[PDB]
């Protein structure tokens, strides 16, 4: 009947193909804004002073950068944590010099992914599922917000955020190892265990289920036509798969329940990523990693060397070369 | 200097498996 009622019925319909919902009205236009700025700025952005030391940096395809070296340059350090939109700038030849589209795209993309998480709640509630997809999607959201928002807040500049490009990502990572020693930090090792265990468990489950497919087809055609869509028959003999796994390793490391197996798959890499998401946030506030300098000492008092005392030399080599034209006073990176 | 051969290699690696997949898809979707 009424305009608002018909509009709400359309926007909470479940028959339009890509669902919208009520978080979708912030998810859709904001991410379209971020995409439409990123495609332009990856192609035709003028060089940007990343350092505030009057040295512009080329990042776009038109100025002699390929797909790997192309990047959206982050905002200058003199710009700091100041909110710097288009309308505060003088011209669009002045907004692009001082790191504009990074400041626009990041602040768009974060709201986009939070509202996308809200949408993943909302469609599950509209269909009648159980609502915990957004809890699992909270992990890469945290991993994005730690490098795009939390770490530049901690360092006080939007310069030290991650540059939006392939060859810029690694120049973030190596200088982060230089200043904060991410490898000697126990949260990061928990995240390495998370991603490696996630790959192991994905390959292991996809092996042990595909190795027990009940035969429904012949040996000439595809082995994927044995599953007609929307049936009620269990296409993999999970009893035989569990028996094979119990013969393979252990009978007390069973996980005979399929639901317990799926809880374990849902909770291994998510909790793996959460600890690195906290580790970046702790290193943002200068809560540095481990330090084993000059630990092994002989009976006289001289200094012996270990692998930590080689990683110290590598981090010295990175540190005396990162930001080569800025640092004068001997510390505070 | 850009490659003499690079754009030819790029265009060939685009067009040859693309046409190879299109032949099989059109042969498949012809019957059904």
């Amino acid at each position: 009947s009424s305009l608002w009622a018909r509009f709400c019925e359309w926007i909470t319909s479940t028959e339009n193909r890509l669902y919208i919902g009520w978080f979708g009205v912030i998810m859709i236009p904001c991410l379209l804004t971020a995409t439409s700025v990123f495609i332009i700025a990856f192609i035709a952005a003028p060089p940007v002073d990343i350092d505030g030391i009057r040295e512009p940096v080329s990042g776009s395809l038109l100025y002699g950068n390929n797909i790997i070296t192309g990047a959206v340059i982050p905002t200058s350090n003199a710009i700091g944590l100041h909110f710097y939109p288009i309308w505060e700038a003088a011209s669009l030849d002045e907004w692009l010099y001082n790191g504009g589209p990074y400041q626009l795209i990041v602040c768009h993309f974060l709201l986009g992914v939070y509202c996308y998480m809200g949408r993943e709640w909302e469609l599950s509630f509209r269909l009648g599922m159980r609502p915990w997809i957004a809890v699992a999607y909270s992990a890469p959201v945290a991993a994005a917000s730690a490098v795009f928002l939390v770490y530049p807040i901690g360092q006080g500049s939007f310069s030290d955020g991650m540059p939006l490009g392939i060859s810029g990502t690694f120049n973030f990572m190596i200088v982060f190892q230089a200043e904060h020693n991410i490898l000697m930090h126990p949260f990061h090792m928990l995240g390495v265990a998370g991603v490696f265990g996630g790959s192991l468990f994905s390959a292991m489950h996809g092996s042990l289920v595909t190795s027990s497919l009940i035969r429904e087809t012949t040996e000439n055609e595809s082995a994927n036509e044995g599953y007609r869509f929307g049936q009620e028959e269990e296409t993999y003999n999970i009893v035989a798969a569990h028996g094979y796994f119990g013969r393979l390793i252990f009978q007390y490391a069973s996980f005979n329940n399929s639901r317990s197996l799926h809880f374990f798959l849902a909770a291994w890499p998510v909790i793996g990523i959460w600890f690195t998401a906290l580790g970046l946030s702790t290193m943002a506030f200068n809560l540095n990693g481990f330090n084993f300098n000059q630990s092994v000492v002989d009976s006289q008092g001289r200094v012996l060397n270990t692998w930590a005392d080689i990683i110290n030399r590598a981090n010295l080599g990175m540190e005396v070369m990162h930001e080569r034209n800025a640092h004068n006073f001997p510390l505070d990176l | 200097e850009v490659n003499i051969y690079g754009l030819t290699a790029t265009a060939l690696f685009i067009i040859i498996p693309t046409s190879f997949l299109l032949i099989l898809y059109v042969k498949t979707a012809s019957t059904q």
């Binding site: 395809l61 390929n66 929307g230 | -």
Partner: peptide, 30 residues
């Protein structure tokens, strides 16, 4: 020269994304 090749490859990837989303086979029932 090569910038046009780069842009053509990126736009073609996005086009295949578009056709994959909207022009798929309908996943049909029993």
């Amino acid at each position: 020269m090569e910038a046009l090749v780069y842009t053509f490859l990126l736009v073609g990837t996005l086009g295949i994304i578009f056709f994959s989303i909207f022009f798929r086979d309908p996943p049909r029932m029993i």
